[PDB]
Design a protein around this ligand. Structure first.
Ligand SMILES: [Mg+2]
Ligand SMILES: [Mg+2]
Ligand SMILES: [Mg+2]
Ligand SMILES: [Mg+2]
Ligand SMILES: [Mg+2]
Ligand SMILES: [Mg+2]
Ligand SMILES: [Mg+2]
Ligand SMILES: [Mg+2]
Ligand SMILES: [Mg+2]
Ligand SMILES: [Mg+2]
Ligand SMILES: [Mg+2]
Ligand SMILES: [Mg+2]
Ligand SMILES: [Mg+2]
Ligand SMILES: [Mg+2]
Ligand SMILES: [Mg+2]
Ligand SMILES: [Mg+2]
Ligand SMILES: [Mg+2]
Ligand SMILES: [Mg+2]
Ligand SMILES: [Mg+2]
Ligand SMILES: [Mg+2]
Ligand SMILES: [Mg+2]
Ligand SMILES: [Mg+2]
Ligand SMILES: [Mg+2]
Ligand SMILES: [Mg+2]
Ligand SMILES: [Mg+2]
Ligand SMILES: [Mg+2]
Ligand SMILES: [Mg+2]
Ligand SMILES: [Mg+2]
Ligand SMILES: [Mg+2]
Ligand SMILES: [Mg+2]
Ligand SMILES: [Mg+2]
Ligand SMILES: [Mg+2]
Ligand SMILES: [Mg+2]
Ligand SMILES: [Mg+2]
Ligand SMILES: [Zn+2]
Lengths: 134, 86, 135, 52, 122, 158, 50
RNA sequence: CGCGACCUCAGAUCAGACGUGGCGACCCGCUGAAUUUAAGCAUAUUAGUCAGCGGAGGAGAAGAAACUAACCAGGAUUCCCUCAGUAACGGCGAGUGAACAGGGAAGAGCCCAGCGCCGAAUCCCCGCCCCGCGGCGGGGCGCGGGACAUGUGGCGUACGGAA
RNA sequence: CUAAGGCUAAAUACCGGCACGAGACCGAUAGUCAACAAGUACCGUAAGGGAAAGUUGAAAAGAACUUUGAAGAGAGAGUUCA
RNA sequence: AGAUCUUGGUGGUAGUAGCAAAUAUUCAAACGAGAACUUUGAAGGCCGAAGUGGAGAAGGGUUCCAUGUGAACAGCAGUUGA
RNA sequence: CGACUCUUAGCGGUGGAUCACUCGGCUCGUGCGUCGAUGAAGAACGCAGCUAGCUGCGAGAAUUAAUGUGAAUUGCAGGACACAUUGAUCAUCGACACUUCGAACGCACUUGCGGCCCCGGGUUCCUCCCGGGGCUACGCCUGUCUGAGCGUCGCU
C-alpha cells in the first residue's frame, strides 16, 4: 500500500484536490483507455482525451460499437461530448449528453507532434519498466 | 423628554471616516480615531479584545506584498535571474 | 524613588497596596539613562555607560553608543557582534551592564530566582505541570 | 488533551501475555475458534524452511 | 493578427512608440463603438487591443530597464530600483567578505592548533 | 470538608494551572529527532568517536556518593602537564580539558594520567594531507583498523 | 446634504454603483448557488455607515 | 587689530548610510490588580498572574564561577527525571515552597580594558588602473583628505603573561 | 572563587505565519462565530456586538405543444427509474 | 417532561381586538380584465400669507426625471407610488 | 337526518426532525520559520463585452513578460490558436509594472495651498500662464562646506 508520508490518503483531501484541480491536470485526470489494437501498436495503455479523436462508449445508455468523434472536452464538468451521443429535449433540439472519458475507449488518436512525443515517452518508460522487472 | 422627542435633535455627526483603517470612528472634535488612533504613529490595539484584534490583523486584508514574500521565500529570494530560454 | 501615578494618591484596593510614596523602581537610574539614550538614538546601539556626576536632584551618566553601520565598526571582528540583528536595543531588554544588574542574575545560592535565564523563565518552569504520556 | 490516553503495563505481564498468546496458537481448537479455517494444515505449529 | 512579445524586441524605440500610439487610437475607437452600440466582434476586440498595449509597454519598459542595468554595471552607486530587493533584514546583514574575515589572533589559533582527524581503537 | 479518617492533603492547584500544562505528545517525535541528529553528527565526524571526547575519572562529591566514581567534564591541566600533552593540542585530538578543576590528591592524578596515556596509545592520528604522512601514524594501522567508536570513550567503571 | 466633500461624494457614488441586481446570466453558470443579490440596500430601509 | 591653531557649539533639500511602523504563539525588560480562598476579614492567597508599556529572533534569554560544597571532593549555560510537596516561609491558619549532590539530552570555548613592548605598526573616505559584478570585494597607486598620542593596531587576560 | 567590562552553537520553547501528514474527535441547533458572496448581512455616535443560511437529478433530460384565466394559478401532454 | 431551561416550529385566543386626533365629499367620462381610492372635467369644501404656499441649512443619498411591470411592499384597494 | 365536538385510520397540507452524505472544523504531530522608507500590515477607489457579491488584479488593472505544459475557456457572444517562420489553456514565477491614503515623508486635511531645479508649448528667453519630469519629513552616524564665541592661546 501507500508508504510515502508526503502523499495523503485522506478522503476529504483527495476529493478537494480532485474537484478543485486546475485544467492542466484536469486534462491528466480525464484520460481514456486505448483500444486493444492501439494498445498493441503503441506500447501504452491510457491517453488523455483530446478534441478530435474517435471513441466508442463502453458503459451506460450509449453502449455500442459505433465510433463517434469527440466534439468537446468540457473539463469544467469532467465530461466529453461525442457526435451521435445526444438526446432530444422538450423543444425538439438536440443536446449532447456528457459522459465521463473513463467510460469510453479511444479507437483512433488525433495525432500531432505533441501527442506522438507523449506516445514515445510513455512507451519508452513502459519498456524501461519491463526491462527492469524482467 | 429624554426619549422620542430628544432623538429628533441629533443632526451633528460626532465621528467621520478615518483616512487610516477606513472606519467611521474618527472623532471630528478630538481629531483622534476611536479604533486606530490615527494621529498616533502606532496602531491602537488591546489584548482585552481578541475579537477586535482578529477583525483587523494581518491576513484579514489583501497582503499584496506578503503574498509575494511568501512565494519568493521558497526559492531563496533569488533576483536578477530568469529561466533558461527555449 | 517612583511615586505611583494614581489620581490623588488613591489606589483602590487592599491596604497592602495603598503605598504611593516610598516606592522604588526596580531598575537603576543608570539603566533609565541608557534607555533614554537608546530611545533617542534608535539607529545606534548602546554599549555601556558610567557615572560622571550627580546633584541632589539629578544624576549624570555618559552612555557609549556604537553606530552599527559604520565601516570601521562593520569591518572589524570582535566588534561585528554589535552589528547582529539580535543585539538591537539591548538597554531595553536589560542586556547592558546597568540593565543586567536589576534582573537578579548570577551563580550560586543567592540567585535561585533566575535559574533558566530570567525570573519569568524560572517561574514558568516551576509553575508548569508536566503531564507526561504515562502517569 | 490531557486525558491520560496511555497506559503502562508491567513488563513481566506483557511477556506473560505474549507467552499465553503463543501457547494458544499451537492448539487447533482455539485457532479454529478464532475462525482461521485450519482443516487441511498438516501441523498447527506450522514451520517452513528458511527459503521462505 | 495578434502582436507577440518576441518580434517586438528587435524593434527600436521609435516604431515601438508608433505602434503603441496606433493601438491606443484603435482602443479609443473601440470604446467609441462600444458606447454607440457597435458589434459584438468589436466589443471582443477591446481585450485584444488592451493586452497588445500591455505587451508593447512591457517590452519598452524591460528594454529601458536592462539598458539602465548595463549602464550602471560596475558603478559604485546605483539607483535604489536597480539594487537587489531581497529583504530589508537581508539587506542590513553583513556581506560575505566582512562576514568571513577573522582577527589575526583567531587565524593564528587555526594555524597553530587545527582540528585533527583521528580514530580510537576499541 | 474532612470526612472520617484520611490524610490532610494540600493540592497546589490554587494558581490557574490549566494555562501552563506541558503535554508530552511530541515525546516520540523528540526522540526520533534526537536520534536523527545523533546519527547525522556521527556521520559528520566520520572516524572520530560518536560520543565525543574522552572524559576523566572523577569521584562524586558528597558523603552520599563518594564511594562511586563517574566521568568528569575534562582533564585538569596538571594531568595534561604530567601526561605530556599541551592544553591547546589536547582538544584537537579529542581530549576534554577542564582548566578550573584542581587535583587535591595524587591518586586521582595518577589514575587520570594512566587514562590519558592509554587513550594516547589507542589513538590513531590521520595526517592532514592523506598523501603526506608527516608524523601522525602509519598508513597500515589507519587503512582498515580505523573505525568510529560507539559509546563513551573508555567508559568510567567502578 | 447638497454641500459635500469629494470623498463623501465618491463613497456615495460607489454605494450607488454596487446597489444593483445580479445579471441574469449568472444563474446559468456551472455551480452557481446564487439566487439574488443579498446585499441590496434601500435608502429608506437601512442607512449608510456615514 | 587683524590673521591663524585648537576647544565647545550651530546651519545645510550638503555626500553616503541608518531608525521609525506591523505581527507578536514562543522570548526579554518593566508596570501590575481585584474577583477568589481563608466558610467573616485587614497580613496572607489569588499572583509577580490578568489588564497596560517597551524590545527582539528563528529561536530568545542564560552562559564559561567573586559557583557548589565540606567530600577520597566536583566544575560554564539550558532542558528532562529525581531530590520534593522536602529544607523553609505562613493571622506557623488557609496556604506557599526552592536548591545541592545523583542519572541523563547536549556539550565549546573564548575576547578586551588595564601592566607592558613595537618609529600609529592602525582605521575610514575620495580619485585612477586592473580582476570580477551579481549581495559589491581583491590587488596596485595618489608630497590625495580625514580619524587617531584625550591612544589605533599586533603580542597578551588570571588556565598566568612577556623578555 | 576573583565582582563592579564583552562575545558564544547544541540540547529548549512555540494556541502567530508558510507548507504538510494523521486521528477510537464532531457531523449542519454538532464541529471554529463562520462547511454557503462570514467577521458577511445587520445593530450602536463610538469603543464594540454579530447572525441565519448545505443536499433536484446519473445526466437539465429544468416540463415543447394544446387548453381556461388579465395574471398568479390549473387540466391534459412530455422527460426520467422516480 | 419539567430547570420563568436553549433554538426552531405550531395552536387556542381569533376571523377576535382593532384599521375612530386635526369638518368632506359628489357627479360624469377616459384608460383598464378589474375603479370608493388613478387621470381629466364639473361641483362642494379645507389650509387662509405666524399656510396644508414658495425656497434654503443640518441630515438623507439618487429618494430627482421619463418609460415599463403589477410578484412582494405602500397594515382596504390601486390602472397609482418615495 | 344534518351542524358542532371528541377518538381512530386513509389521504392531502404546514413544519423540517430523523437518517444517509461532507471541498468544513477541532485536536495532535512534522519541516521551515520569511515583513517595512527599495515604502509594510491595514484602508480607500477603480479594473471584465455582457459583472452586484466573492475572488483576482492596479490605469500594462478578473492581468503583461518568461519558463514548463500542450488544445482549450465556456453562462452567452466574439475572435483567435499552420500546435513549425512557435502555441489555446493552466501551472510555475526569477523579468517588468504596481493608483490614493497609511511609519507616510513639502505644509495640511470632514478643506486646499506652496517652494526649488530641468523639459515642452502659448511665449518667440524673459520670465508670466499651461502641461510633464525630479526634488522638498523627523531623528541620527561618518565625512564636507559655511560659520559663532569678552572659551584657551600664538603671531602681529
Ligand atoms: Mg438619560
Ligand atoms: Mg461635540
Ligand atoms: Mg492581600
Ligand atoms: Mg587583541
Ligand atoms: Mg428614517
Ligand atoms: Mg543629503
Ligand atoms: Mg517595533
Ligand atoms: Mg473569604
Ligand atoms: Mg464563602
Ligand atoms: Mg465578602
Ligand atoms: Mg499581559
Ligand atoms: Mg543570545
Ligand atoms: Mg549573554
Ligand atoms: Mg574567567
Ligand atoms: Mg518521596
Ligand atoms: Mg508565591
Ligand atoms: Mg551525553
Ligand atoms: Mg593597547
Ligand atoms: Mg454551526
Ligand atoms: Mg439535519
Ligand atoms: Mg398574485
Ligand atoms: Mg422515489
Ligand atoms: Mg423536551
Ligand atoms: Mg371587529
Ligand atoms: Mg374603528
Ligand atoms: Mg370656502
Ligand atoms: Mg377657510
Ligand atoms: Mg414652508
Ligand atoms: Mg417621482
Ligand atoms: Mg394593502
Ligand atoms: Mg403528514
Ligand atoms: Mg504568457
Ligand atoms: Mg479648512
Ligand atoms: Mg576668541
Ligand atoms: Zn482610524
Amino acid at each position: 500500500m501507500k508508504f510515502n508520508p508526503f502523499v495523503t490518503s485522506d478522503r476529504s483531501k483527495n476529493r478537494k484536490r480532485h474537484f478543485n484541480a486546475p485544467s492542466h491536470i484536469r486534462r491528466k485526470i480525464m484520460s481514456s483507455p486505448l483500444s486493444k489494437e492501439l494498445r498493441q501498436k503503441y506500447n501504452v495503455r491510457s491517453m488523455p482525451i483530446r478534441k478530435d479523436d474517435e471513441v466508442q462508449v463502453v458503459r451506460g445508455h450509449y453502449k455500442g460499437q459505433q465510433i463517434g468523434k469527440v466534439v468537446q472536452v468540457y473539463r469544467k464538468k469532467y465530461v466529453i461530448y461525442i457526435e451521435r451521443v445526444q438526446r432530444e429535449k422538450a423543444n425538439g433540439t438536440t443536446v449532447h449528453v456528457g459522459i465521463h472519458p473513463s467510460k469510453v475507449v479511444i479507437t483512433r488518436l488525433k495525432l500531432d507532434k505533441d501527442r506522438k512525443k507523449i506516445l514515445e515517452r510513455k512507451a519508452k518508460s513502459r519498456q524501461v519498466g519491463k526491462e527492469k522487472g524482467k | 423628554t429624554k426619549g422620542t422627542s430628544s432623538f429628533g435633535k441629533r443632526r451633528n455627526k460626532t465621528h467621520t471616516l478615518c483616512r487610516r483603517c477606513g472606519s467611521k470612528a474618527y472623532h471630528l472634535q478630538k481629531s483622534t480615531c476611536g479604533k486606530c488612533g490615527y494621529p498616533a504613529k502606532r496602531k491602537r490595539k488591546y489584548n482585552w479584545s481578541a475579537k477586535a484584534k482578529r477583525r483587523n490583523t494581518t491576513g484579514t486584508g489583501r497582503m499584496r506584498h506578503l503574498k509575494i514574500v511568501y512565494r519568493r521565500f521558497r526559492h531563496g529570494f533569488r533576483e536578477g535571474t530568469t529561466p533558461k530560454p527555449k | 524613588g517612583r511615586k505611583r501615578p494614581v489620581p490623588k494618591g488613591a489606589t483602590y484596593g487592599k491596604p497592602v497596596h495603598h503605598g504611593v510614596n516610598q516606592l522604588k523602581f526596580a531598575r537603576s537610574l543608570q539603566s533609565v539613562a541608557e534607555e533614554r539614550a537608546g530611545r533617542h538614538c534608535g539607529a545606534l546601539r548602546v554599549l555601556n555607560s558610567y557615572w560622571v556626576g550627580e546633584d541632589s536632584t539629578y544624576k549624570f551618566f555618559e552612555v557609549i553608543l556604537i553606530d552599527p553601520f559604520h565601516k570601521a565598526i562593520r569591518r572589524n571582528p570582535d566588534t561585528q557582534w554589535i552589528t547582529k540583528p539580535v543585539h538591537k536595543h539591548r538597554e531595553m531588554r536589560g542586556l547592558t551592564s546597568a540593565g543586567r544588574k536589576s534582573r537578579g542574575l548570577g551563580k550560586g545560592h543567592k540567585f535561585h530566582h533566575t535559574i533558566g535565564g530570567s525570573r519569568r523563565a524560572a517561574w514558568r518552569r516551576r509553575n508548569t505541570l508536566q503531564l507526561h504520556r504515562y502517569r | 488533551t490531557w486525558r491520560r490516553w496511555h497506559r503502562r503495563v508491567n513488563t513481566t505481564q506483557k511477556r506473560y501475555a505474549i507467552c499465553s498468546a503463543l501457547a494458544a496458537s499451537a492448539l487447533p481448537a482455539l485457532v479454529m475458534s478464532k475462525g482461521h479455517r485450519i482443516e487441511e494444515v498438516p501441523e498447527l505449529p506450522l514451520v517452513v524452511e528458511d527459503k521462505v | 493578427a495578434k502582436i507577440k512579445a518576441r518580434d517586438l524586441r528587435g524593434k527600436k524605440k521609435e516604431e515601438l512608440l508608433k505602434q503603441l500610439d496606433d493601438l491606443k487610437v484603435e482602443l479609443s475607437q473601440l470604446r467609441v463603438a462600444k458606447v454607440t452600440g457597435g458589434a459584438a466582434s468589436k466589443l471582443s476586440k477591446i481585450r485584444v487591443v488592451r493586452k497588445s498595449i500591455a505587451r508593447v509597454l512591457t517590452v519598452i519598459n524591460q528594454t529601458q530597464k536592462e539598458n539602465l542595468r548595463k549602464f550602471y554595471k560596475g558603478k559604485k552607486y546605483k539607483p535604489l530600483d536597480l539594487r537587489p530587493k531581497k529583504t530589508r533584514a537581508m539587506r542590513r546583514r553583513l556581506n560575505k567578505h566582512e562576514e568571513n574575515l577573522k582577527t589575526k589572533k583567531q587565524q593564528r589559533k587555526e594555524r597553530l592548533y587545527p582540528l585533527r582527524k583521528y580514530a580510537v581503537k576499541a | 470538608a474532612p470526612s472520617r479518617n484520611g490524610m490532610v492533603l494540600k493540592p497546589h492547584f490554587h494558581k490557574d494551572w490549566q494555562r501552563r500544562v506541558a503535554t508530552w505528545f511530541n515525546q516520540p517525535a523528540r526522540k526520533i529527532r534526537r536520534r536523527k541528529a545523533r546519527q547525522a553528527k556521527a556521520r559528520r565526524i566520520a572516524p572520530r568517536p560518536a560520543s565525543g571526547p574522552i572524559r576523566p575519572i572523577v569521584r562524586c562529591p558528597t558523603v552520599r556518593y563518594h564511594t562511586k566514581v563517574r566521568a568528569g567534564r575534562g582533564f585538569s591541566l596538571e594531568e595534561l602537564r604530567v601526561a605530556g600533552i599541551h592544553k591547546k593540542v589536547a582538544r584537537t585530538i579529542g581530549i576534554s580539558v577542564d582548566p578550573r578543576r584542581r587535583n587535591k590528591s595524587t591518586e586521582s592524578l595518577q589514575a587520570n594520567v594512566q587514562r590519558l596515556k592509554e587513550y594516547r596509545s589507542k589513538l590513531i592520528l590521520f595526517p592532514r594531507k592523506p598523501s603526506a604522512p608527516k608524523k601522525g601514524d602509519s598508513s597500515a594501522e589507519e587503512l582498515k583498523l580505523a573505525t568510529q567508536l560507539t559509546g563513551p570513550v573508555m567508559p568510567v567503571r567502578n | 446634504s447638497s454641500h459635500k466633500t469629494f470623498r463623501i461624494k465618491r463613497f456615495l457614488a460607489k454605494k450607488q454603483k454596487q446597489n444593483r441586481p445580479i445579471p441574469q446570466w449568472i444563474r446559468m453558470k456551472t455551480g452557481n448557488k446564487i439566487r439574488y443579490n443579498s446585499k441590496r440596500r434601500h435608502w429608506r430601509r437601512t442607512k449608510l455607515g456615514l
